Design a protein around this ligand. Sequence first.
Ligand SMILES: [Mn+2]
Ligand SMILES: [Mn+2]
Ligand SMILES: [Mn+2]
Ligand code: NI
Ligand code: NI
Ligand code: NI
Lengths: 227, 227, 227
Amino acid sequence: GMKVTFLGHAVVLIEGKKNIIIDPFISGNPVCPVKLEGLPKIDYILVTHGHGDHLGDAVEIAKKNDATVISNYEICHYLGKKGVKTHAMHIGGSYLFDFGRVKMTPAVHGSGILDGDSMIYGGNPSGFLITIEGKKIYHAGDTGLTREMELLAEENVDVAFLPIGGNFVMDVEDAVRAAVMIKPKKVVPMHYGTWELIFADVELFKKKVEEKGVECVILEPGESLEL
Amino acid sequence: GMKVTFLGHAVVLIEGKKNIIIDPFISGNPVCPVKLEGLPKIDYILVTHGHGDHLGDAVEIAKKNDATVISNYEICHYLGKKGVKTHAMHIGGSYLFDFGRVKMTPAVHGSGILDGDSMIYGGNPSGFLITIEGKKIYHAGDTGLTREMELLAEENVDVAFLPIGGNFVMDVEDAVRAAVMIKPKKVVPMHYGTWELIFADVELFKKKVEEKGVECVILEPGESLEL
Amino acid sequence: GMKVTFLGHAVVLIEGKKNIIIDPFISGNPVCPVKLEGLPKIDYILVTHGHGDHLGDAVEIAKKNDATVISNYEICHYLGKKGVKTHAMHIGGSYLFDFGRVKMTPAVHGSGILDGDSMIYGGNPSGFLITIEGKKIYHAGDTGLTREMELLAEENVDVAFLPIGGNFVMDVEDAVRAAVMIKPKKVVPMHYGTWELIFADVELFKKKVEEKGVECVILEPGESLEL
Ligand SMILES: [Mn+2]
Ligand SMILES: [Mn+2]
Ligand SMILES: [Mn+2]
Ligand code: NI
Ligand code: NI
Ligand code: NI
């Protein structure tokens, strides 16, 4: 019986036997209700791609917790040079960790790491399919609509986190199409409202996806559900 | 009632209330019928990926026009350091500009930026779906055949620009398959003939795609259609 | 009547009128039964992506043979600076060489080139569809499961090499799904066992894919089949 908390933008914290955080953009995240000090003990950090609003505080959280960062090969190379413990994977690959299974899923996006004024290659972007005690969480990362999402329908995902903010990621209309492709038991919208460029009508998303038969739960930053 | 002009290779100029150019490879483009001075006022420049035969003269055109370059996050970072005004997006994302909507579409290709002798990471490659006054133009950028194109069928695209030159991009046979996937009202072949490596039998493309029920319009560089 | 030899990890050697090697990771490859000196004359080297366990000894093999390396634009740029003869292509593109046709196929993965301590951008990762005297070989490169593989079903591939090692690439279960998508006449598992991280139950793969109606041939490193 784990606690899954949305912390704003794309930050998702999973508290169970082990504690896992995805795309830990805490410092400088204007809708994040906690500071780094407010986080619990962290065991794993999952990073979907290199962009700073996802990579976030991964280095500091990992070092302060002796946590392992799970990401693609190229991002882990970058982090390794920062003195961070990593477990590299790549797109479509999966591994069984002490807490459960992680699979990196395809995304259509980019994965540059901005280090000073230099854009470093951070592999290709992903999402994560996480299986813990028979329960499945999908975090799509940053992505546009892609037919690769149809590969997830047979998984019978319990909770799918989908970006709806538009411009850099799917807007509301395409995220509805994604929800229909994936057919999760519940969908949670994310990556909206953080800046005005990614404003989204989240109430309209909930209304439209529920009309297609998929339950939607709107989590404000700091709110949680149990799996 | 806009004027859409093919200027050779992958260069497409849209003249309406605002003027938009896609992949503005003008200087050094051996099939381009105009020089930079021959271009009209430009409001927007769309860049599908980092390769020089698409990025082209984007920097000079933007600075001489105070134009905005629309491209992915990584390419816009590169251009920003060149003093260019940008509006960053990423794959599958869309935004409503003063002239109409632009959506970046998935492509399967690469996006290196050659800066001197260094290959800079330019994100992931895209195409563009452009909606202006209810009319839709698809420019596929450089790409191979991908099932992501099937996402465009429901758009009822008016004009689709598809590469047919082979080697770096789809050849004639795969571009026919793409046309069948997308089902646009009209298809225009591009990215062929510019160099001998990308020779294509464009008359055979027209013949084969029309046998599948899709009207093909062959535009020589400098020729145009109205939308 | 060509000889196709699996040399371990992802190394595939095709001996015919011309000799072709794919992802020539020889030196430092712990399951490779030959040393560089043990290779025959090489005419072409195909590199699916930038990762060192695939790029491998491409530079030394090419220079010692005056061989041409076929890969994406970005990888060929890197190799060109190493003094290597290249023929650049990109994803979905094809070209007819003196020995037959090569087409680069989509993969979902990454393509960083590790040069010293720097990660260089090596384009996007691919596989190869090779057509020689009417016979077709698919080498998927490193990849996760992707619907782009369904584009290959109509090719009636004779032999498909698929990664099954998990973590960085498809595991056994997803590779079975891939085999069903592609429907080749025979499948050969690869990219497993080389390190403990990519252990795979290869006998289980053979059993499961044959239950789906696809013949599987397990080649130990050094074993071959004729096409
Ligand atoms: Mn983001
Ligand atoms: Mn091009
Ligand atoms: Mn590999
Ligand atoms: Ni992003
Ligand atoms: Ni290109
Ligand atoms: Ni790899």
